[PDB]
Structure formats: C-alpha cells, structure tokens
Design a protein around this ligand. Structure first.
Ligand code: NA
Length: 298
C-alpha cells in the first residue's frame, strides 16, 4: 500500500540494486523522493534502521515513510531540490574560504555525531551531499544515501558505540570500522580541496585511468601551492594535508577536524572570492573516476 498514499512520478536515479523516483503525497500534494530497493538483490535493513535512528539530525536526509510489499522496500525521504552541494558551490564565482569553512563545519559536525554513535557512512562522496532547497545556507545541507553505511555491533548482534567496548566485537570488525571512519574523513578532504581550488586532488577528468588515480592516492603527496592555491590560507592547506593524509592512523578524526583553527576561527578567514578553476562538469567526471578507481573491489 505505498501507492494508496503516494503517486509515483519520474526517476531521479537508477542502478542495478535500487531505483529512486520522485513521488507526491496524495493527501497533501507535497513532493517527496522514494528509493525502491529489490529485497531479492539487497538487504536494506541496516540503511532503514540508520535513517530511523539518526535521520532527525538536521543535516542527514530525513525519512518520512517506509513500505515493504514482500518484494520491494519503499523508503520515502525528503526530496532534495537544491542539487549536489559541490556542483552548486563550484558554480558560485564569489565563494570564499569563510563560506567553505562553514560548509565543512556543518558536514563534519554531522559525521562526528554519526561516528560517535558507531555509524560509518562508507560512501561519502560529493555526489551524496546535497542541498534540500536553494536558500544556500549550511542549514539546508543533507548527507544522503546511507545504502553502504554500517552500525558498529557486537558478535551477538548488540548495537555498540565506540565509547562502550565492554562486549565482544571481533577485532577484524573493529579494525575495519577504524579504516571505514578514516575514509569518511579522507572524502571530506577530497571535498575541501576541490571547494577551495575548483579541481580534484587525484584526477584531472573522467578519462584518467584508475591506475594513475590510485598511484597519486598511494603517493600521499598533492599540490598545496600554485595558481589556485597561492592566495589560500596556510591553515586551510594544513587541514587539507591532514584530512588527506595517506596513513589513516595519522589522518584527522572528525573530532580533530572540528578543533582545527580553520574551522574554529572562521571569523579570521577571507570573505572575498577564492581563485579557482571553473570546470564543474570536468570535476564531476574526475570525482566519478576517483571513486570508480577506489571501489573496483567492492
Ligand atoms: Na534530517
């Protein structure tokens, strides 16, 4: 009985595992998104649990309804109408470090909360951070698509947070949770770098080979000086270097990013425009190439 309350409209996004469509609440004429998941192909219980427990967060996509007809699950959420966050920011010619810091603060505050509750996102690419409307304010930011996110839990299925470790979680579930959390922050590093300069740290466009992108990621070195960098803060370059650190053990935590002086002293940052490349569509293909390179063993 999804269709008794909602009218289905057009596809927002399709793949081999789930389909996303716009829908209308028949009673109110309010627009929503529905993610329809094939239960035979994939088990959405973890995703739905995560959105129920944590989607009241102001910057996590909010769940509005769930239906299951045995075969499909239908996950109804608020419809993002402001587009992808990085794409809109790359198309604003007068964007400033002060605005970029407010944006990273709002997103990293949300990830700090999720990590502190034992959730890792595991797919935190720019294309999953959207604006819900066009107000342009950090309040309208939403982290989306929790379809690869995992709740930390014990061998006997008990939910755990990383503060209470007095119940047996296997060390290989624990170690992989520390890797997965550090990859959440590395992705916010890839987001910051691109917002500050208008290009991606490890890929120049969609036709970069996966091997040369992974070779750059393994080098643990990237430019933080040059045309688009020369006028940017040292404190911003520091943050970026420490978010993109090649060893996850030395990479910053969300907690440590929020204590960084580039986030803490936002009022000491430039309000004038950054100096950036203007190629948002090329960055979309470079971003897709990068995550394609990393996820090839998925
Ligand atoms: Na929310």
């Amino acid at each position: 009985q999804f269709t008794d309350g909602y009218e289905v409209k057009e596809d927002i996004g399709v793949g081999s595992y789930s389909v996303c469509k716009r829908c209308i609440h028949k009673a109110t004429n309010m627009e929503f998104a529905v993610k329809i998941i094939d239960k035979s192909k994939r088990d959405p219980t973890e995703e739905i649990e995560i959105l129920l427990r944590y989607g009241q967060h102001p910057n996590i996509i909010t769940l509005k309804d769930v239906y299951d007809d045995g075969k499909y699950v239908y996950v109804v959420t608020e419809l993002m109408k402001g587009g992808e966050l990085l794409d809109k920011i790359l198309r604003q010619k007068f964007f400033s470090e002060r605005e970029a810091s407010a944006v990273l603060f709002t997103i990293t505050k949300t990830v700090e909360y999720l990590h502190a509750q034992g959730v890792v996102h595991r797919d935190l690419k720019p294309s999953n951070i959207l604006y819900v409307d066009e107000s342009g304010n950090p309040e309208s930011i939403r982290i989306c698509d929790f379809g690869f996110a995992k709740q930390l839990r014990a061998e006997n299925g008990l939910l755990m947070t990383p503060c209470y470790t007095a119940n047996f979680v296997a060390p290989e579930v624990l170690e992989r949770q520390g890797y997965d959390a550090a990859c959440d922050i590395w992705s916010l590093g890839v987001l910051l770098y691109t917002m500050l300069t208008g290009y991606t740290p490890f890929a120049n466009g969609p036709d970069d080979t996966p091997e040369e992108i992974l070779a750059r990621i393994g080098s643990g070195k990237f430019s933080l000086s040059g045309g688009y960098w020369n006028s940017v803060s040292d404190t911003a370059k520091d943050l970026v270097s420490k978010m993109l650190h090649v060893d996850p053990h030395q990479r910053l935590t969300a907690a440590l990013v929020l204590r960084h002086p580039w986030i803490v002293h936002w009022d000491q940052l430039p309000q004038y425009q950054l100096n950036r490349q203007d190629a948002p569509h090329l960055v979309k293909g470079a971003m897709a190439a990068t995550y394609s390179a990393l996820n090839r063993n998925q």
